[PDB]
Motif scaffolding. Structure first.
Motif, PDB file in Angstrom:
ATOM      1  N   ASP C 205       0.794  -1.217   0.000  1.00  0.00           N
ATOM      2  CA  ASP C 205       0.000   0.000   0.000  1.00  0.00           C
ATOM      3  C   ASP C 205       0.840   1.288   0.000  1.00  0.00           C
ATOM      4  N   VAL C 206       2.117   1.152  -0.327  1.00  0.00           N
ATOM      5  CA  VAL C 206       2.992   2.301  -0.433  1.00  0.00           C
ATOM      6  C   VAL C 206       3.870   2.087  -1.643  1.00  0.00           C
ATOM      7  N   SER C 207       4.769   3.015  -1.912  1.00  0.00           N
ATOM      8  CA  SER C 207       5.674   2.823  -3.021  1.00  0.00           C
ATOM      9  C   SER C 207       6.703   1.785  -2.621  1.00  0.00           C
ATOM     10  N   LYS C 209      10.126   1.957  -2.687  1.00  0.00           N
ATOM     11  CA  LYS C 209      11.215   2.420  -1.812  1.00  0.00           C
ATOM     12  C   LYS C 209      10.626   2.671  -0.448  1.00  0.00           C
ATOM     13  N   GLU C 210       9.357   3.047  -0.432  1.00  0.00           N
ATOM     14  CA  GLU C 210       8.707   3.292   0.826  1.00  0.00           C
ATOM     15  C   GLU C 210       8.571   1.988   1.585  1.00  0.00           C
TER      16      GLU C 210
END
Ligand SMILES: O=C(O)CCC(=O)C(=O)O
Ligand SMILES: O=C(O)CCC(=O)C(=O)O
Ligand SMILES: O=C(O)CCC(=O)C(=O)O
Ligand SMILES: O=C(O)CCC(=O)C(=O)O
Ligand SMILES: [Fe+3]
Ligand SMILES: [Fe+3]
Ligand SMILES: [Fe+3]
Ligand SMILES: [Fe+3]
Lengths: 275, 275, 275, 275
Positions: C205-207, C209-210
């Motif tokens: 649910d994030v990028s 790299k995130e």
């Protein structure tokens, strides 16, 4: 008259020619330029053999100036900072920073004049806080929106490099303080990341390992090439940027050649976040 | 006749004008150019409205060509790869890589022709393996000199993005193999870092956490702005680089506009390390 | 009769003596024990020379069992997994994982019986997902609460280590799926971190790299000694844990001695998050 | 008489019973014990209700004592340090450190006496510098063997937590200095990692990002469970360790309960590296 403005990327940067800097700008051109510095976050102008006085004047068109508490100033113009780098004074700007975020009211803009250059090298790049924010996932925007981070003049001006009496001076006069991680632009109202490796020490609203993980992430994120522009300097080049939604980095790869840059620094208001 | 060569930095990059690409290069100019591609690691030429055939010819002056096992080719020239990016084929090159290091004998050079460009964006940058090596402390040079690392076509061409039959093909035909971490240039004899985030999976000569720590370090190190050049593309621009001591990254910030680039890829010999 | 329960820390772990495992537990003792496995997340019992059958029976008192798709089973008890490690089968559990989180309905508990031990080493530790959650700053709890992460049987059972036909089997039968990052305990209702380095590949649910930054943070966080208990094994020791709010790690520091452990694995329900 | 020594792992730790600490140790037992503290790096003894004086005496059997420049001492025994933690003095030892590596001649050993304990928690763990070294790949051993790192009392005793006059005192009396990254044991001659997160600031023999990468690697490496032992304290427990080839960490998970520990600190010689 219409200024020629050439964008250097979808996000950040543009090059303009229309001005005779030597000459005060017509209200009309100043607001084409002013608006260009906002749309693009940095703008470059070439062939502008101005003097410090003339540079200070143009800065004033943007607002009150700020005097650096450390850096030396020009002849009889204390508002224009001199950056004369060489072996006896090696360059310290090869590190992503936003200028003077160690004050309550960090500068809204600065104007850089390329006075004396080496054969090559010395490129300076700028990274967009707006584009970096837009690149965060929503949950990350929600996580960072509202956090506050401490900025410390000392992180980029350590004791050991200094005088020690005039350094202490600038320290007691500039204690660490907090700014929002995500800054809302006072004019455009656009959201932008507002930490910088040069002065940001910790995100105070999370745990220490947490802050550490977010900052390592952020100090790398703003490094993504898409978020940037890189300028190959030429003598009498002028650079003007919006210091409230950018960071920049100045390459240290020209020693022992000398390099001279003049800077006018424009005071901003107090950074905030809004939704 | 003398080619005009303008260096874009102390390390990497230069821009040249002297050629009428349309026309075969005089032995004499080819070796000014050849030598420029080595001294600088990348060179840029503008206003070179060549065809695929004409591009392939110029590549051949450097050596045998390599055919990409995945990417589509030009009309009736299978040696020139076509990179037509847009919504129906989003760009996958926004990541630091060295071209085709997943073969025994990864390419010594490539020639990029800017055929069709978007309004802005699409900048491509190059990073010097020589400058990055020189930037390592001695103990780090000694640590990395002699290690070997595995390169895996699969890391930058994963299954899920693929056809699956022609993908398997290229896989069984290109298994992971080892190259030296520090590569000695077959001509200049200069030492250069030779890992790339696109294909390097692990340094096989250390432990797993060790490799992981060295690669995170290295995949960030080569990212230092001093080690690089950034090119703002213009139609009919030609780019030529030494793929054995560089990496490059192509910005993904132009969609949904279209962008077309032709590439000639030149086979190299087997990378080695010597002291 | 009252079981003697000795807590081994403020958070996780406890040691009990009251049972004659050989003998079925009186409803009454089973619910002292059951409740102990929940309050503390792991419990240790010593001197319990049980058989596989007898172990399976006790597991059933907790719920239906799960059969591992890879690991070998006991004599004529396919519900009890055998872990016989030595030179010809080196131990693969020296890595923080939660058991079988690669299924929709990962196990609620497991029961480990120490059958045959080496001179020393082989310690197994457990880390509390509850204590780790409570240790996150609020903004981090808010960031992680609601994210989902992918679990992949393949990350901890890679192809190369395998048969290859029976491995594929277990793969097509266990594709990557999503679980919540923060899991609400189906009984206690307590919030707990629910990623594990063994099977969690990415926070979807994030990028990228995130996710990568959050997981590096999380795979280190759960490693904090305060969140844990460490057990020095003794023959016929029994270990019982709540696999829905813990992870564990089994030391690989006893080869070439042999070590034999029996496991009963208890099916859980579907992990969820609630506020 | 023969001491009973029970190893707690293949590497680090052992528990002994043979002594009546109350009573001076017979030359003979002292050298069984002395040798146990070297073979295992830490040893634990239970039921030893000694006094500070009696503890200091036993320490002296090992060598001259060191007086801590910050920590408070016992009644009329300035060689024994008192660690009385609680709400009005929260514990600061939940961090991997080696004791007093900020002096030229950091202590060879210390003796910890558990005087007053909370219900649970307060566990202290030790990690082997020998086992961690042996776990490094050869190229890593070669990289780290010979590097030097700076230790700074200030990193684990920051100004803000302090008095400020007596803190400055201890600072001007303990400036940052260098120790070898890999230390050769003055007796066993075994090689061991010798950095600690508590006091090690940077590996001075590499670049800054390089040091940073090696230390992040090292401060995590020594954290591997195989390299450790964990002690669940009991009143009148005695702990004795070889501070020249270990680090330890004391859990902060017992507040607001109180916890009292006495320490005798034994001066060592000057750490060195040899091949
Ligand atoms: O020297 C340069 O090119 C820019 C230096 C810098 O960071 C500044 O003037 O703020
Ligand atoms: O598209 C570009 O600008 C370069 C793409 C690339 O990496 C390549 O052609 O090798
Ligand atoms: O072998 C052990 O001590 C535990 C192994 C493990 O992770 C398991 O049985 O789930
Ligand atoms: O308090 C403890 O358990 C140990 C504290 C510590 O690090 C020390 O006494 O050196
Ligand atoms: Fe600046
Ligand atoms: Fe490429
Ligand atoms: Fe397990
Ligand atoms: Fe200590």
């Amino acid at each position: 008259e219409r200024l020629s403005i050439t964008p250097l990327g979808p996000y950040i940067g543009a090059q303009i020619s229309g001005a005779d800097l030597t000459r005060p700008l017509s209200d009309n051109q100043f607001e084409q330029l002013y608006h260009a510095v906002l749309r693009h976050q940095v703008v470059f102008l070439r062939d502008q053999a101005i003097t410090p006085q003339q540079q200070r004047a143009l800065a004033q068109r943007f607002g009150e100036l700020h005097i650096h508490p450390v850096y030396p100033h020009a002849e009889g113009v204390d508002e224009i900072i001199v950056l004369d780098t060489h072996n006896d004074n090696p360059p310290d700007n090869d590190n992503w920073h936003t200028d003077v975020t160690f004050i309550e009211t960090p500068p809204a803009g600065a104007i850089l004049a390329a006075k004396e250059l080496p054969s090559t090298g010395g490129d300076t790049l700028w990274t967009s806080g707006i584009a970096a924010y837009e690149a965060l996932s929503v949950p990350f925007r929600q996580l960072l929106s509202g956090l506050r981070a401490e900025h410390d003049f000392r992180k980029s001006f350590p004791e050991y490099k200094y005088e020690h009496q005039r350094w202490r001076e600038a320290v007691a006069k500039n204690p660490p303080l907090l700014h929002p991680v995500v800054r809302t632009h006072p004019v455009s109202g656009k959201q932008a990341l507002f930490v910088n490796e040069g002065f940001t020490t910790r995100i105070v609203d999370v745990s220490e390992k947490e802050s550490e993980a977010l900052l390592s992430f952020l100090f790398a994120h703003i490094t993504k090439p898409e978020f940037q522009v890189r300028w190959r300097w030429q003598p009498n080049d002028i650079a003007i940027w919006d210091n409230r939604v950018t960071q920049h980095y100045a390459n240290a790869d020209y020693l022992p050649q000398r390099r001279i840059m003049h800077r006018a620094t424009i005071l901003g208001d107090k950074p905030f976040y809004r939704a």
